[PDB]
Amino acid sequence: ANTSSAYNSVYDFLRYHDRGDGLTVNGKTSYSIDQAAAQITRENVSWNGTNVFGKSANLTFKFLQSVSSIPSGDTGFVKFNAEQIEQAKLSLQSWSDVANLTFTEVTGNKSANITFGNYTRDASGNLDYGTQAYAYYPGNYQGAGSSWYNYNQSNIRNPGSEEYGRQTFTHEIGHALGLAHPGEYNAGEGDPSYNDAVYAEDSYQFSIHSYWGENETGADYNGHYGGAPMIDDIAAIQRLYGANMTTRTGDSVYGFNSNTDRDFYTATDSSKALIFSVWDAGGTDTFDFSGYSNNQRINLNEGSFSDVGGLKGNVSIAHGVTIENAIGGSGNDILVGNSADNILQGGAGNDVLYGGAGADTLYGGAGRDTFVYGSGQDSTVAAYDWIADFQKGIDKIDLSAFRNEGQLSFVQDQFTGKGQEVMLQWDAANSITNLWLHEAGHSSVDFLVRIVGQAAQSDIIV
Amino acid sequence: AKAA
Ligand SMILES: [Ca+2]
Ligand SMILES: [Ca+2]
Ligand SMILES: [Ca+2]
Ligand SMILES: [Ca+2]
Ligand SMILES: [Ca+2]
Ligand SMILES: [Ca+2]
Ligand SMILES: [Ca+2]
Ligand SMILES: [Cl-]
Ligand SMILES: [Cl-]
Ligand SMILES: [Zn+2]
Ligand SMILES: [Zn+2]
Numbered sequence: 001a002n003t004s005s006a007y008n009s010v011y012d013f014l015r016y017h018d019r020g021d022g023l024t025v026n027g028k029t030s031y032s033i034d035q036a037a038a039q040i041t042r043e044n045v046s047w048n049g050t051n052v053f054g055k056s057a058n059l060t061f062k063f064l065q066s067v068s069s070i071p072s073g074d075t076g077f078v079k080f081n082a083e084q085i086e087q088a089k090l091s092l093q094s095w096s097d098v099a100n101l102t103f104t105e106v107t108g109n110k111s112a113n114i115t116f117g118n119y120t121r122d123a124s125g126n127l128d129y130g131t132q133a134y135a136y137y138p139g140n141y142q143g144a145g146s147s148w149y150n151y152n153q154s155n156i157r158n159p160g161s162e163e164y165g166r167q168t169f170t171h172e173i174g175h176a177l178g179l180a181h182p183g184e185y186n187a188g189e190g191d192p193s194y195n196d197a198v199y200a201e202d203s204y205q206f207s208i209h210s211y212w213g214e215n216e217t218g219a220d221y222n223g224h225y226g227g228a229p230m231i232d233d234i235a236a237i238q239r240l241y242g243a244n245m246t247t248r249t250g251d252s253v254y255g256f257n258s259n260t261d262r263d264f265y266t267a268t269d270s271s272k273a274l275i276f277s278v279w280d281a282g283g284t285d286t287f288d289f290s291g292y293s294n295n296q297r298i299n300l301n302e303g304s305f306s307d308v309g310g311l312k313g314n315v316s317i318a319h320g321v322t323i324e325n326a327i328g329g330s331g332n333d334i335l336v337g338n339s340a341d342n343i344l345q346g347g348a349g350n351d352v353l354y355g356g357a358g359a360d361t362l363y364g365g366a367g368r369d370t371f372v373y374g375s376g377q378d379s380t381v382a383a384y385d386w387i388a389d390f391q392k393g394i395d396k397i398d399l400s401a402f403r404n405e406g407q408l409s410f411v412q413d414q415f416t417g418k419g420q421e422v423m424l425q426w427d428a429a430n431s432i433t434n435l436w437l438h439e440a441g442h443s444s445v446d447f448l449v450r451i452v453g454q455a456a457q458s459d460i461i462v
Numbered sequence: 463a464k465a466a
Contacts, residue, residue, distance in 0.1 A: 043463070072464065134466035175465040187466035 004400040004461055006370045010354045013297050013334050017205075017217075017305045017313060025200030026217070033303060033319050036201055037235035039182055040209060046178040046240040047113060047138045047145075054242045056100035061092065062112035063105075071136060071143030074128065076120030078151045084169075087159040088116055090263065091169040094228040095177065097262075098279040098318070100242040113138070114176045118151035128152065131187065133168050135175035147172040163225040170228060171208050179236050181209045205305075205313045207232040219305075219313030226275035226314075228264040231303070234279055234318045243320060249282030254323075255308075256291040267291060267309070274308055277316045278323065285323045287315070290347055292329035300326055300338045328365070341383075359383040364395050370461075372398040376439045376447050384448040390433075392454045397435065398461045405440055408462040415445065422462065424455055435460070 003011070019025070020032030031039065044050050047057045063080040070077060080088065092103045092114075106112050122128050128150060135147035149156045149168065159165025175181075182202040185192035194202070194212040203212045205219040207230050214221050229237065253259050255274060258266040264276050270291045287306070289296055294310035300323050306315040317323055326335050330348040337344055339357040346353055348366040355362060355371075356378060362371055362385060371387050379385040387397070399422060402408050406420045415421050419440030424433055433455045437447035 131466070134464050137463050137465075181465055186464070 001404050002400075003403060004398055006352045006396075006398050006461075007372050007374065007400050009334055009352055010336060010372050010374065013299060013336055014301070014304075016297070016299065019201055028197060028200040028202075031199040031201050033232060033235050036182065036199065036206060036232040037239055039198060040179050040207060040232060040236040041239055043137060043178060043180045045137050045139065048241075053239060055240075056102075056242055058102045058104070059113040060104050060106045060110070061114040061116070062107065062110070063088075064115050064117040067117060070117070070119055070148060071146060072119075072134065072148065073123035074119040074121065074148065075123060075125055076127075076151075078118040078120055080116050080118065081157065083158060083160050084116070084118075084149075084156070084165075087166050088169050088173075091166065091173050091227070094170060094262070094264065095173060095237060096244065097247050098229060098234045098244055099237040099240070100244050101177070101237075113145045114173065115146045116149075117146070118149050118156065120151050132156070133172050134187065135172040137175065137180075138178050145176045147176050163227065166227040167208055167225040174209055174229065174233060174237070177237060178240055179209055179233065181211065182207055182232075183211065185211055201232065204230070206230055207236075209233060214313065217313070219311075221275055221311050221314055222273065224273040224275060224311075226264065228262075228276055231277040231316045231318055234277055238320075243281075244279075245281045248280045248285075251283045252280050252285045253288050254278055254285070255288040255327075257288050270309075272309075273311060273314070275311070275314045277318050278321060279318050280321050280323065284325070286325040286327065286343075287323060288327045290327045290329050290345075293331050294329065295331040295333060295349075296328055297334045297336075298326045298328060299336045300324070300340075300342060301336065302338065304336075332367075355379070355385050359385060361386045361388055363389045364391070365389070368394055368396075370396045370398050371449075372401075373449070374401045376402075376437070376442070379447055379449045381446055381448045384450055387449060387451045390451045390453045390455055390459075392456050392459060396459055396461050397449065397455070399437065400461055402437070402439070402462070408437065410457050410460065410462065422460065424457065424460070426454070 023030035129152040133149040155162035155165035194216040203217040204214040292309040297307040308315045325343040327345045328347040337356045341358040345363040346365040433451040435449040
C-alpha cells in the first residue's frame with residue numbers, strides 16, 4: 001500500500017484533529033462534537049427552563065444606565081460606551097445567526113433577560129484592574145442573565161479594536177444563554193490549568209468558553225482572538241434553542257470577497273486573520289482564501305478544521321453544514337473536498353486537490369498541481385470529475401491509492417479485460433482527454449475523469 | 463450561578 005506523498009498528505013489532513021471514538025489526545029479523553037456540547041450545556045438550563053431542548057426563545061436585552069447593586073458585590077458601576085454597545089450587538093447577532101433566538105433591546109425601567117454593565121471596584125471599594133468579566137445563567141433569580149465587565153481593562157472599553165473584548169462579550173452572552181465552561185473551573189477559585197481539562201478539546205480551538213489557549217491543542221492563532229461562537233458552542237447552543245435554518249441560505253462567500261456582512265467571516269486584505277466556525281443553512285457556498293500567500297490546508301468536510309492564512313486550526317465547519325467550493329492562495333495548498341459536488345481552485349503555487357466523492361470541477365491554477373484520487377468512488381461515470389485547466393507535463397493526476405488492489409497498468413488504446421488498467425483517450429473534436437480507469441472486479445469501466453486539455457502518460461502517477 |  002505504498003502510496004505517494006501527495007495522497008498521504010490528503011489522507012493525513014482528512015484526519016487532522018480526529019476526536020472521540022475512544023481516542024486520547026494530549027493524554028486526555030477525546031470528546032466528540034456532541035460529547036463536548038453536552039458537557040458545555042451540563043447545567044441543563046436555558047431561558048425555557050431546565051432540560052428543555054430544541055425550543056426557540058425570544059429574549060430582551062438592556063444596556064444598564066444605573067444599578068442599585070451588582071449581584072457579585074463588585075462596585076463602581078459604569079454604563080456601556082458606544083463602542084461596547086456596537087460590539088455587544090454584533091456578539092448577540094453571532095448567536096442569533098446560529099440558533100433560534102431573537103434579541104430585542106429594551107430601555108428605561110423595563111426588565112430584560114440579558115443585561116450589560118461594567119464595574120471598576122471590588123466589594124471593599126478598592127480599584128480592580130485585574131479581573132475581566134462574568135455572567136449569570138438564565139433563571140428567575142435576581143441577576144439571572146446579567147453580564148458584567150471590568151471597565152479598567154482596555155480590551156473591555158475598546159472591544160472593536162482589542163479582539164479579546166469582543167470575544168469576552170460573545171463568551172459572557174453564551175453563559176447568559178445557558179452555556180457552561182467545558183471544565184469545572186472559574187476565575188477566583190484557585191488556579192486551574194489545561195491539566196485540569198476534562199477532555200482534550202478543552203481549548204479556544206473548539207469553544208470560546210474554554211479557559212485554555214488554542215495552542216494547548218496544537219492550533220495557533222498568533223495572538224488573535226476569535227470573535228464568534230466556535231464549533232462546540234454552535235452545537236451546544238443549537239441543542240438548547242434549535243438551529244437557525246434561515247441564515248445565509250443563498251450562495252455565501254466566506255473569507256476574501258465575502259458577502260456575509262459579518263466581520264468574523266470577512267478578510268479585507270492579507271494581513272487580516274480569520275478565526276471562525278461557519279454556520280450556513282443553504283445554497284452553494286465558497287471558502288475564498290485567495291488573498292493569502294501562506295501554504296494553507298482547506299477541508300470542506302462538515303466538522304473539520306482548516307489551516308488558513310498561516311494560522312493553524314483557525315477555521316472549521318459546524319456540524320450540519322455543507323460548504324461546496326474552495327479557493328486557495330498563492331501558497332502551496334491542500335484542498336480537500338467533501339461528498340458534495342465541489343469546485344476547487346488551487347490558485348498559484350503547487351497545490352494538491354482532492355475532490356472526494358461527487359462530481360467535482362478542479363482548477364489547479366498556475367503551478368505544478370496534483371489532482372488526487374483515493375477511490376473508484378471519487379469519479380464514477382455517472383458523476384465524473386472535470387479537471388478544467390490541466391497542464392500536460394506540469395500537473396499530475398495521482399492514482400497511487402489504487403495500488404492497494406494492485407498497481408494500475410497504463411494501456412495505450414484498448415483494455416485487455418484483466419482490470420487495474422488506465423487509459424487516456426483523446427477526443428480530437430472537442431479537445432477533451434477522457435481518463436478511463438478499469439478496476440479489477442468491475443465488469444464495466446466505471447471510473448472516468450474528463451480533462452479539458454491534453455495529458456500524457458507521464459502525467460499520470462500510478 | 464456565576465461563570466467568571
Ligand atoms: Ca449559504
Ligand atoms: Ca451549502
Ligand atoms: Ca495555491
Ligand atoms: Ca466532492
Ligand atoms: Ca496551483
Ligand atoms: Ca497547474
Ligand atoms: Ca469527485
Ligand atoms: Cl468525500
Ligand atoms: Cl462533452
Ligand atoms: Zn485578528
Ligand atoms: Zn466564563
